[PDB]
Design a protein around this ligand. Sequence first.
Ligand SMILES: *[C@@H]1O[C@H](CO)[C@@H](O[C@@H]2O[C@H](CO)[C@@H](O[C@@H]3O[C@H](CO)[C@@H](O)[C@H](O)[C@@H]3O)[C@H](O)[C@H]2NC(C)=O)[C@H](O)[C@H]1NC(C)=O
Ligand SMILES: *[C@@H]1O[C@H](CO)[C@@H](O[C@@H]2O[C@H](CO)[C@@H](O[C@@H]3O[C@H](CO)[C@@H](O)[C@H](O)[C@@H]3O)[C@H](O)[C@H]2NC(C)=O)[C@H](O)[C@H]1NC(C)=O
Ligand SMILES: *[C@@H]1O[C@H](CO)[C@@H](O[C@@H]2O[C@H](CO)[C@@H](O)[C@H](O)[C@H]2NC(C)=O)[C@H](O)[C@H]1NC(C)=O
Ligand SMILES: *[C@@H]1O[C@H](CO)[C@@H](O[C@@H]2O[C@H](CO)[C@@H](O)[C@H](O)[C@H]2NC(C)=O)[C@H](O)[C@H]1NC(C)=O
Ligand SMILES: *[C@@H]1O[C@H](CO)[C@@H](O)[C@H](O)[C@H]1NC(C)=O
Lengths: 202, 202, 252, 209, 209, 249
Amino acid sequence: EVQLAESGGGLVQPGGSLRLSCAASGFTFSTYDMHWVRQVTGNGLEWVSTIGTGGDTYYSDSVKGRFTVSRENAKNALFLQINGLRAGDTAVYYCARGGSGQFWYFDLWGRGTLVTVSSASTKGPSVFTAALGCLVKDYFPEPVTVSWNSGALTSGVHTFPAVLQSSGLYSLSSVVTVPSSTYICNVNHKPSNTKVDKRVEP
Amino acid sequence: EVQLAESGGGLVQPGGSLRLSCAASGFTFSTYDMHWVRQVTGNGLEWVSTIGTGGDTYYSDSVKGRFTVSRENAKNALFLQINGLRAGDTAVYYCARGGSGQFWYFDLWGRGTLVTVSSASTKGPSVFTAALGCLVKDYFPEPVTVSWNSGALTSGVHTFPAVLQSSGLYSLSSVVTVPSSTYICNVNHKPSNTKVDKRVEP
Amino acid sequence: FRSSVLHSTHDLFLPFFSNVTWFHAIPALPFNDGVYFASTEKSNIIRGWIFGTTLDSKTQSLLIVNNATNVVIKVCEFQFCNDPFLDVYESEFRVYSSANNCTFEYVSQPNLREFVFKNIDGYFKIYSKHTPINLERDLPQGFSALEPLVDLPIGINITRFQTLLALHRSGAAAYYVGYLQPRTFLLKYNENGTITDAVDCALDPLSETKCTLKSFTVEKGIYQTSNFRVQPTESIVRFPNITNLCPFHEVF
Amino acid sequence: DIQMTQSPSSLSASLGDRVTITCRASQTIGRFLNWYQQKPGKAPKLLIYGASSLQIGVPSRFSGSGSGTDFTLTISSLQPEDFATYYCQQSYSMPPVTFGQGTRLEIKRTVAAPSVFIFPPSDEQLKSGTASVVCLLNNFYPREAKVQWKVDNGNSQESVTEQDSKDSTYSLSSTLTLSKADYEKHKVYACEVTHQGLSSPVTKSFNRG
Amino acid sequence: DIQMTQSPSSLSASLGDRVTITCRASQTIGRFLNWYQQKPGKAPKLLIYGASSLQIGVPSRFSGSGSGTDFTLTISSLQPEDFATYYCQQSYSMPPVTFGQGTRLEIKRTVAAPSVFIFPPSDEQLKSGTASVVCLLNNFYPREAKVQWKVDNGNSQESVTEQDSKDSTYSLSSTLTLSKADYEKHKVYACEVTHQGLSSPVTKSFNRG
Amino acid sequence: NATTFASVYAWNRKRISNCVADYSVIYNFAPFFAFKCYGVSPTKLNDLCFTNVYADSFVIRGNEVSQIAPGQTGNIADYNYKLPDDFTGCVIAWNSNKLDSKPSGNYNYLYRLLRKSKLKPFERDISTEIYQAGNKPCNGVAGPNCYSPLQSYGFRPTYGVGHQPYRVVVLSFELLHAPATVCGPKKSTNLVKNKCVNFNFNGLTGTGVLTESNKKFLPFQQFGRDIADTTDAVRDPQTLEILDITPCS
Ligand SMILES: *[C@@H]1O[C@H](CO)[C@@H](O[C@@H]2O[C@H](CO)[C@@H](O[C@@H]3O[C@H](CO)[C@@H](O)[C@H](O)[C@@H]3O)[C@H](O)[C@H]2NC(C)=O)[C@H](O)[C@H]1NC(C)=O
Ligand SMILES: *[C@@H]1O[C@H](CO)[C@@H](O[C@@H]2O[C@H](CO)[C@@H](O[C@@H]3O[C@H](CO)[C@@H](O)[C@H](O)[C@@H]3O)[C@H](O)[C@H]2NC(C)=O)[C@H](O)[C@H]1NC(C)=O
Ligand SMILES: *[C@@H]1O[C@H](CO)[C@@H](O[C@@H]2O[C@H](CO)[C@@H](O)[C@H](O)[C@H]2NC(C)=O)[C@H](O)[C@H]1NC(C)=O
Ligand SMILES: *[C@@H]1O[C@H](CO)[C@@H](O[C@@H]2O[C@H](CO)[C@@H](O)[C@H](O)[C@H]2NC(C)=O)[C@H](O)[C@H]1NC(C)=O
Ligand SMILES: *[C@@H]1O[C@H](CO)[C@@H](O)[C@H](O)[C@H]1NC(C)=O
């Protein structure tokens, strides 16, 4: 098939060097232009930079001066080197291709990568007919969702997205329905390599 | 291109004779029927008369008896003779062509001519954050509009359509925007060949 | 390039034995499809030409103005000057009263002389040839092919033409003008690629014969050449008599 | 003899909206009906002929429907070039053809308010007894504005401009003409206006000295 | 430098309804505009490019319209796969390209009311000086539920889940954040709720556990 | 690289025609502060071709770099230089404070302030006069209250303000109804002989064996044909040697 790969997104200290990667497949990569568009959490798309077929590079107003886009004609390898990152640069980046024609439009999109710039670190979270649930504090960006009773529960289970904390951490909230005419909330924090749970029995 | 010419529409005394002219171009004129439709100021279209390929003539109820439509196969010339005009006949006449088919429909329209029946004559006009302007009274149908600052100011300039007077004259309104935290209007009149100007102040 | 072969081409050529207009100086001329220009005067008399469609104020168009040793081309929008001329005070211009919206200024290096102009493709073709003559002022009774030397990308629709004479700030300036028409010619190429002679196939039945046989020498015989056919001259419409008179008359 | 009843004189809609211009006949006329488009300031042009056929050169967004006694000219996506006046013509009776009263297509936006201004004319007209009293309205979106003249808390016809291409608002001007030696007949002249979006403008009146 | 103004952030409509997503530009950009579709669970994808050309693979129900300064993305019949976020982008000034703020497409249904619940956490957080109190608003159709906090009758960021695929309602979660010594200094708290259908629940008192 | 830039009130619009344009040399000059382009794709500029490329150079204030645009509004915009609503080109600007090293300033730099703002695009109003400030014409010279000439730019604070001068080079790419001559550069590969190759000589595509020929052409011949309209010879540009084309075995 035809798709665009991506790799290199992750946490980095403010001002540290970072280099993203994009790998195309399924077409003649040497005859199409590539673009880089980011999207802040809760915000819309924002064009970052692009490179034409002739090797010429272009950047945005707040992007030029610290970014550096590169592209190799062989191996379908696309790169984007960044330096001097700040907290305001945290956004979801996407690898896009410039379609044929006389104007810039993204006919193909990649998988997309997440880039977060902060000085914080991973910290173990603490977990704390009626409807109640468990409260999580001092969380961290996680790749797996929170489940109740290892997901075997068939009752009403919901999970809210995390909220930003002052020290760079997160906090998550979950609710559940219990009979009140008792389950265990399982918070399996993957980046901390430690699982924590609590109970909300009446 | 393909268009229909027109000439002869103008001021005429009540009951005086009048003959319009229409000239086609860009198609075979001898194989299409022609129709005459008028449009009173502020009113809709009104069919006046017509003539077919065979030379037969037809008129409306309030039109038959005083009108006379004629058409020549050569020179693509179309005419419409009128006699016994009155004030109620003031309307914009359009030269229209009847399209091929079984029913009457206007597939081609001309430039259109204005016919006004009145016994009056042309009379010279005169100049009669805040917003004010120059009033015009005792006016006449004109081809040029009132301008401000000798025609150099057009942003905050507006011109109202004229209104008919009892003696056959006109009255036009014009306003302008001046600073009030000084522009000179120019009332031009081509049929009178006289221009008047005067400044304003808040 | 082609070898010693006979190639039939259909393009705008000057018909053989045509009625070429002879002009003398002391207005403009039409431009139907191409003007054949020729003159035997000195090089200090004729020094350029002006082309255009409506040379009054608009329809941007202008053409050659000649130096003494250089060529100057410009197609700016020109306010044309009736009876234009180049004055020698010392070279100066008089027709350039207002040069606006200029485009493609071109400069290059520049006996009986011949010139051919064409604009039918979108470009501006110019062909020239310089050969010595033995007559006084008449055209030479010979053959000489004109070679392209300009081929400019000027994209202006040209419909009028007028020459420029060199006047020294105050029966003369004789030049020939011919018009081109779409004709079929049989061109003979030499072994080196030069045209030695040609045949205007629409001139006489003998040329029509040399066209079908594709040879300048025709052997003794009878040759089928073309097809004769008489075209319909008038039209006849016939129908039976009108009868029964539509007795509607008796109804009224 | 045949009469036509078209849609109201004005229809308000925005770009890309769907407008169904309805026009009914006095009796069954079959399909002998055609439409016309006329932007104010130039000659009309036909769009639908025969109530089923489309004129060559007209975009596919226009569509004619209905037959017999009710006809509906339906537009799918309004464009800036579509805002104009439309008329329906019957063709069942060829000699006595008639047209509808017309229907205006205006741009829909917020309901602006008329900036009611009042100012005296120049002294040139005031020099003679035949003076004038004017009233001004500037940049109001609706068109249902009615102006009267109150004498001491001579009336003439008012004037209305076309809809602005940018502000999409109308302007209205009124005047009060006086006869010879009639200027000093009254000291106060009130301008009474009623507009959809502005109330009580009658307080603005002339105060002669 | 060029800025784009799209439709409101959210649009409510049901299946098969007609949606006309309007997006205007700061000046005349001609036809150098393209539309994109982005589901919050996957990468974006283009639908209309050049404001007149349809992308291959997109169903014919999507249609782009408008040019110059106003563009309208018209959808004829909404499908379950059409409910997503859309963005407009100008292409006139290609190096300084800018995107729209976005427009959400949600399923229209009855106006559900949020079941307001509040419960204190365990003593594990009360052991620390930074306690918390949550205020739950679950299963309500709208999304603009403004929730605040009142101390003795601090505020923090709330959290909202995506619209349910069966109930077509949103769920909101707000939390009261108390800093050091604020958990031990203040004892009475109140959740401020504002949403359609409720009798102005500006104060929902609560006592520290 | 003119090193002698003109003033904004009198910009030196230079016309380019029948050139290669070497679009790879523009961004190799110096780091540009403003590299905004328009409806002509910059990444695809080297592939397109235009009839006339109009170059325009001038100097403006540091706050005026955002003023050279179609949707413009400002002093330099309405009074000095205006781009059309549909502009197909680019705007290149870089720091010019190092070049104008003169603490005195005000030299060789002037601009417009009044006198018929919203000037028509690409029209130079260099006619020097005095605006009609007041009723008296002031005899066409300065006098009471008629102090309205075209003003000069005070580039005095060298390295002392953020409003440093910037040199702007405006490019106007236009494609009229005429054969375009300002195209991109055309690459050329090495010539091979005595082997079947897919050749392309100045647009003449074909397949065959290229061999040296003894035939001599005329100076304007770039195409060799034989009977039956076959292509048996070419000019082989960049070497001007005539090659014989025989069909592959
Ligand atoms: C042929 O026609 C051309 C016009 O296309 C004439 O060229 C012009 O010649 C004058 C006189 O030499 C030039 O003026 C001088 O230019 C030099 C340039 O450095 C300048 O230093 C002098 O002070 C003086 O202004 C003019 O620039 C030149 N124009 C062009 C476009 O070439 C030429 O004189 C004619 N005759 C010949 C024999 O070429
Ligand atoms: C197009 O560009 C090519 C590349 O420069 C030109 O070819 C060059 O032609 C000159 C002669 O005009 C050659 O100089 C000669 O070189 C030989 C061998 O070194 C030497 O014996 C002679 O005395 C003379 O110096 C030059 O070498 C040659 N360059 C190459 C790379 O072959 C060509 O003339 C240009 N024009 C055309 C129409 O092709
Ligand atoms: C070439 O054309 C000219 C111009 O037609 C011929 O000269 C005479 O011109 C007048 C006025 O135009 C005509 O009425 C005469 O009929 C022309 N003469 C003849 C004989 O037709 C001139 O004769 C033509 N020459 C040739 C060789 O055809
Ligand atoms: C200068 O000439 C150009 C070239 O004609 C004008 O641009 C338009 O060009 C097209 C074809 O390329 C013509 O069909 C148009 O008629 C031209 N425009 C006009 C207004 O005629 C350009 O407009 C000209 N400049 C001026 C100031 O007239
Ligand atoms: C053809 O060219 C050759 C070589 O230059 C020359 O010897 C011969 O005379 C030429 N023939 C003609 C007819 O010009």
